[PDB]
Ligand binder design. Structure first.
Ligand SMILES: Cc1cc2nc3c(=O)[nH]c(=O)nc-3n(C[C@H](O)[C@H](O)[C@H](O)COP(=O)(O)OP(=O)(O)OC[C@H]3O[C@@H](n4cnc5c(N)ncnc54)[C@H](O)[C@@H]3O)c2cc1C
Ligand SMILES: Cc1cc2nc3c(=O)[nH]c(=O)nc-3n(C[C@H](O)[C@H](O)[C@H](O)COP(=O)(O)OP(=O)(O)OC[C@H]3O[C@@H](n4cnc5c(N)ncnc54)[C@H](O)[C@@H]3O)c2cc1C
Lengths: 650, 650, 175
């Protein structure tokens, strides 16, 4: 049976995403083992729409196919989730990149590293902050992001307003407002606003800043000697022409490395409890089998790691037998469970003034800010019942705030609201959830070949139906069910209570302008503010009006207002693309990242995270891959590599 | 290379859908050739949710996974189409069944056969109505549908009203109203309403009825001796336990037939211009190769026939080379082009009355009516500029009308409109498009393995942007661009002008009730009616207000009303699942169904139709497969098989 | 066949099934258990030895399950057989919950003879390749040479008589 594609080795890494390349690179650098990478994708080093950062916004799109890279089946997998019973049963498609570099070839390029507190309070032993912060330093040094290269006065006004009201939040003694950081003290952690003001680094090495108002992010772009920016991503850095031949061999130093471009993997041939081989389909349609000697690594992303595991034989035996899996290995009913993701409701602001163009200048997107102009990361609101115990003594990251010019609601909402993108006296504010509550799971549907869409369940904004039970002991399930909608409403109020300090700051900053939230409607926010400050910590009793027993017309007003307000976060919002926690630590893998019930396979992508980090989930996956390098190799080498040693660029 | 799965033969049929089983059955019945069927799916003969017709509505759904069969990746392929630039860039998922029997295992079971005129005016030579009507008789005899088993007075009232106004439409001499059939004459083709009134057969043998108002459809269910109904579909009839062994062999008469249950096919190994072999992936993940001696047949549905062709090597050489296809055979730039489908905007009716429950009785769905209670099929509206030349002398089928209890708009629209499904004084009317204008195309994205989602483009309700050209010779592109929106608006008016005859009929039928259209809004329909009857055949100039030059406030009223009305068909509607015309006759295949540029492959599913038929597209695909039986075999055998010879049921 | 010779076998079968308990509270159970403990209090006194709410393996305290939130559950089918008289709140039914959310029935054929262990043609699979199961076969009697059973006959679904030899032993599990 003459197949000369004998690619037997000792380590096989599957999926060259944000974590696959880091591992393959630093694994062939520090040892002599024979390494193989399989990705099922070519290298888009020459594509203008990839390498140019501004191509993300559709600058190179043919006029008849105006879709960008997340909606393009030639660039990204297209999985759709089953009807969201919390969002009027609207199915959604969220992508995972299909190329060297994974989703980093198609993403927005932001570098939130996540707070310090999360890795100290939500991760297992060995994964506390002080065990990994060095790895975060390693990756941010390997990329070297940059800051915004353009000033603007709107950032100054907004930072002014936030410090103004953080002054009061510092007083009044309440301990859990959203602008209090405990690692600084009485002084607010708000960046100064004047020429020669220093810059507060969000991703600081010692994690002092978990709540801070700044002016710019750190995007993963570099400037070339010519004057043009390009994209600096995982495949760009760790796997470029200098390190790997066009035929897939490494060069000299890394001669013990093999990369196959287009090879879709199906499952893991598995003798006993010992993985022994892997098969894949090349671009004819042939099945090639390769031996594994020493270990197998799975870096296939959040959606497609549990899936390949389940086809392999690890999962729920009853289910996999039901749908027709012939070979069964380990009976873990938790594989593909506990899926987590962020979520960002959207609001926009109207400015009334004859010459407000002077106010909104220098807001357009360049390859250094990518339309991001701030503003800060906030903590828990004062009136949110779902806070951990440590909230009295440690500050947690809850909301990530973003400001952007133009309007960003969906087109149907644009038509409905009466405000369009043509006019230029409008801008958008976003209060992202980082601690988003809902949880889902992933189930395969056919044991034949890797399918683009497996069963993915994710219900977010569900409702609570009261029972005949006495009110006293049914409240603490209403709390658990209504957490996310409460969080979104509190984000709305938090953004709302900024615009008045912004009014004052603009008035005495040389601007006769007026600021106002028009989406959601003005009245529907003033009523929420009044209801909050008149009903206190028991404001959220009124989501269910049959239990408050408050038949006063004021109570009916509050119930109706919350009913209407519950509509906006369902439709006028944007599910993010930060999928994580499919095979988390403890649930499916141990703290050394090995799969329970087997001795020589590990999962090391973002699916293995036991909690979503404090922001955009790119650094985290790379960190996990980097740490996996050490755990596989045995001794810390990437650990204290000097920071002046960085991969060369080509 | 020891693979004992040597399944070399002379005919291979790929995809056992509405046309695959008919062909395989009648092909092994009338000859001695060795036949093989490949489907990639098991047989759901025992599943309650399949066999019970009422299971279509989710009677056997577990409470945690309340999705039915079209949204279930274990039952149906899930392809999503790229953003619809006409529908606010809303991607949609439409399914194709994955089982023996294809989409017939998951469909609504209706038997519109299509008008006679369409097969006479829109199909090639050899496919005129009188060449095939016998095949339609054959399939309807092989199924034996039934009628509704429950009377209701709403049907009587609506038929009464339609005859009342068809009386006037018969007079006034205008030739192209929607209730004029030319094969009957002065008398309306409206079914009589009293006890002992005869039944007008919609699917009549000689095609006299192309416009007719009736009371019931023909669904594909049978009643068992016990008292329970089951589903009678393609796999149920042609491939059941009586004809095929559980091991896939045929029995006696059909001993020369092989069926493999779970086998996903990839592409066609293709020596020279002669197809020679086919490969597939079983439920391990193995590649099995089978020889073909004599011919290859493709019955893989509208979405996945052009795709397997393109992976095979037939298509646009530049494109397939671009995305990495190594072997190229024939350069046909039309493969996967010309996609067609129906579309059904929705409206609902309010009834005001103290005891209207007496009016709406006996409307619930049973397995014989499946919530369908009429009402008729109509022709072109009087004021639609896009009519063929033959409209003066032949009547064409345009709208298929349906009445149903309850509300059927989407949930978000339900909340927006203020009317919900709990209350019971409301019902739905649907004016389906059968001659829907927009056209799209299908392109693969990766030459590795059959993917669930390839590039599918389908833009429906686009808008026209005027240029600086003089108005005189830019109108007849505005016409072509605005056809479908005009059609939807005219359907709205057609339904609207029925409710007043319904008012009169109810008043003097023993009912003191009131009928009114509340969705879309009452005023927004009365204004459209007035605008139509005051502006005449030039009512559709006002879609673009910059060219009418009518600055009168009446003209501004008309423009604003049409602008608002253009919103409802975009969102409050339902794209159907009748995909067709991917490899039509002439475009990709000849009239003998062979693929241009090759001698021994054919495509015979609904993708090969050169025009969408006059209604639900199930009979048509089976008819095409049945005719293919004759073309392959050479002499007409299924042609005059006596109608008393029918497959036995088990 | 005394208890201590078999209790292990009972454990084996209950482990092979893994029943479940009731998944729904109710206050009628609480009221009735309350009443039974109330009168078992008196039955414990008065010295009579053979009332219906006296268990001797517990002593003066009644064997009545507690009624409040966080009350433990008295296992009726306990391994060491202490509870021969006890008032509880729920039984152990032989149903399982599937990952979807639907319950199914867990019975003898479901467990010991399912698609994983036996082919659709009646053969066992691998480990159990030395096993044969015939689905529709009504047995009539035991062909019986001397005092030694030697064969058995049965009627299949045509109506034919098939005879099979026995070498070593015959077992009757016909109810
Ligand atoms: C639309 C979008 C927006 C984003 N925005 C941001 C942002 O603002 N900030 C930020 O920090 N990050 C952003 N990201 C990136 C994202 O948050 C993370 O970078 C992502 O989780 C990367 O983690 P990963 O490497 O584990 O996943 P991936 O990069 O998806 O790794 C999966 C890899 O495995 C391959 N693979 C999958 N299945 C198979 C198979 N069967 N066989 C072989 N190979 C396979 C895939 O092709 C891919 O190369 C965005 C991503 C997207 C898609
Ligand atoms: C939601 C829904 C509603 C419907 N409603 C109606 C209705 O009201 N009235 C009506 O008359 N009809 C209805 N239908 C049926 C539909 O209109 C037609 O019956 C359909 O076009 C059947 O035609 P077909 O056999 O060519 O397609 P299919 O039945 O889809 O045939 C395709 C077959 O090929 C198989 N296949 C596909 N790709 C591969 C591959 N790579 N390898 C192997 N096998 C493959 C599929 O599994 C399937 O068995 C409905 C269908 C759906 C899904």
């Amino acid at each position: 049976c003459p197949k000369p594609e004998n690619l037997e080795a000792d380590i096989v890494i599957i999926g060259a995403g944000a974590a696959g390349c880091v591992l393959a690179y630093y694994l062939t650098k520090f040892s002599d083992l024979k390494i193989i990478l399989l990705e099922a994708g070519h290298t888009h080093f020459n594509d203008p729409v990839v390498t140019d950062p501004m191509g993300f916004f559709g600058k190179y799109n043919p006029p008849n196919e105006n879709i960008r890279m997340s909606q393009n089946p030639s660039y990204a997998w297209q999985p759709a989730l089953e009807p969201d019973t919390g969002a009027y049963s609207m199915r959604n498609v969220v992508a995972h990149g299909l190329a060297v570099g994974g989703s980093t070839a198609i993403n927005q390029l932001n570098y939130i590293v996540g707070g310090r507190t999360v890795f100290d309070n939500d991760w297992p032993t060995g994964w506390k902050y002080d065990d990994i912060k060095k790895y975060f330093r390693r990756v941010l040094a390997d990329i070297s992001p940059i800051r915004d290269g353009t000033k603007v006065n709107l950032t100054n006004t907004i930072l002014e307003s936030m410090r103004v009201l953080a002054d009061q939040q510092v007083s009044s003694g309440v301990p859990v407002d959203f602008l209090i950081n405990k690692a600084t003290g009485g002084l607010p952690n708000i960046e100064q606003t004047y020429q020669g003001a220093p810059i507060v680094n969000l991703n600081d090495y010692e994690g002092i800043n978990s709540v801070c108002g700044f002016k710019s992010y750190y995007v993963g772009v570099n400037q070339l000697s010519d004057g043009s920016y390009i994209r600096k991503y995982a495949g760009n850095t760790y796997l470029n022409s200098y390190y790997v031949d066009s035929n897939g061999f490494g060069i000299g130093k890394f001669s013990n490395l093999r990369v196959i471009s287009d090879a879709v993997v199906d499952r893991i041939h598995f003798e006993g409890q010992r993985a022994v081989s892997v098969t894949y389909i090349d671009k004819k349609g042939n099945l090639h089998s390769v031996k594994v000697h020493k270990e197998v690594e799975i870096c296939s992303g959040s959606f497609f790691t549990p899936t390949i595991l389940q086809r392999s034989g690890i999962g729920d035996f009853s289910y996999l037998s039901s749908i027709g899996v012939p070979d069964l290995v380990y009976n873990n009913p938790l594989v593909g469970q506990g899926l987590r993701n962020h979520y960002s409701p959207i609001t926009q602001v109207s400015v009334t003034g004859p010459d407000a163009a002077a106010f909104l200048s220098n807001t357009a997107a360049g390859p250094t800010n990518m339309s991001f102009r701030g503003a800060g990361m906030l903590g828990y609101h004062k009136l949110e019942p779902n806070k951990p115990s440590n909230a009295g003594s440690v500050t947690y990251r809850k909301y990530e705030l973003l400001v952007t010019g133009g309007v960003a609601i969906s087109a149907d909402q644009q038509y409905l609201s009466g405000i369009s993108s043509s006019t230029g006296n409008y801008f958008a504010l976003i209060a992202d959830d980082i601690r988003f509550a809902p949880v889902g799971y992933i189930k395969i549907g056919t044991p034949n070949f890797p399918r683009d869409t497996p069963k993915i369940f994710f219900n977010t904004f569900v409702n609570y139906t009261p029972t005949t039970d006495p009110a006293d002991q049914q409240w603490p399930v209403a709390q658990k069910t209504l957490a996310p909608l409460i969080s979104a409403l509190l984000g709305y109020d938090a953004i709302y209570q900024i615009v008045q300090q912004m009014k004052v700051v603009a008035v005495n900053a040389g601007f006769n302008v007026t600021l106002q939230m028009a989406y959601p409607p003005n009245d529907l926010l003033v009523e929420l503010h009044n209801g909050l400050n008149t009903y206190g910590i028991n404001w959220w009793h009124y989501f269910v009006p049959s239990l408050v027993n408050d038949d006063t017309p004021a109570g009916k007003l509050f119930a109706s207002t919350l009913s209407k307000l519950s509509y906006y976060p369902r439709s006028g919002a944007h599910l993010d693309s930060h999928q994580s926690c499919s095979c988390s630590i403890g649930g499916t893998v141990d703290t050394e990242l090995k799969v329970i019930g087997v001795e020589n396979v590990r999962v090391t992508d973002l699916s293995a995270a036991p909690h979503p980090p404090g922001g955009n989930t790119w650094c985290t996956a790379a960190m996990i891959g980097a740490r996996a390098t050490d755990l596989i190799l045995g001794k810390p080498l990437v650990a204290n590599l000097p920071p002046e040693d960085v991969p060369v660029f080509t």
